[PDB]
Design a protein around this ligand. Structure first.
Ligand SMILES: O=C(O)Cc1ccccc1Nc1c(Cl)cccc1Cl
Length: 121
């Protein structure tokens, strides 16, 4: 659920889901349209897509359990949705961690009209 994802984010990037990633680029936090502005934005685009493969699930509210073996994120067995949701969030976290070096504040609160064009998953 949104609750786990943010915590996962924080541990991974040292940044807070809100407001560091809740309104970044064209896909972080609300998604919808345009061309992902950067790597971090790309992470969100993929992440939205991931959630997309689970029409009959509820990512925002279904909670899952996970542990860190050492530095690694390991999703614990739960419902199928729960497991596939976790794998989606884990990917996004690692992704964020992998592009922290290019995170740009000029993309915080990015205005909607500056996101043109559809991009397929
Ligand atoms: O893909 C993302 O960056 C995350 C993302 C996508 C869709 C919806 C919400 C979020 N994040 C989000 C979180 Cl992670 C916590 C509190 C409030 C919000 Cl809106």
């Amino acid at each position: 659920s949104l609750l786990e994802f943010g915590k996962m984010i924080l541990e991974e990037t040292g940044k807070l889901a809100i407001p560091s990633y809740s309104s970044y680029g064209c896909y972080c936090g609300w998604g919808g349209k345009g061309t992902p502005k950067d790597a971090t934005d790309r992470c969100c685009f993929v992440h939205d897509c991931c959630y997309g493969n689970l029409p009959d699930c509820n990512p925002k509210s279904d909670r899952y359990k996970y542990k860190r073996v050492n530095g690694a994120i390991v999703c614990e067995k739960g419902t199928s949705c729960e497991n596939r949701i976790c794998e989606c969030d884990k990917a996004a976290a690692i992704c964020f961690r992998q592009n922290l070096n290019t995170y740009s504040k000029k993309y915080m609160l990015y205005p909607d009209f500056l996101c043109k064009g559809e991009l397929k998953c």
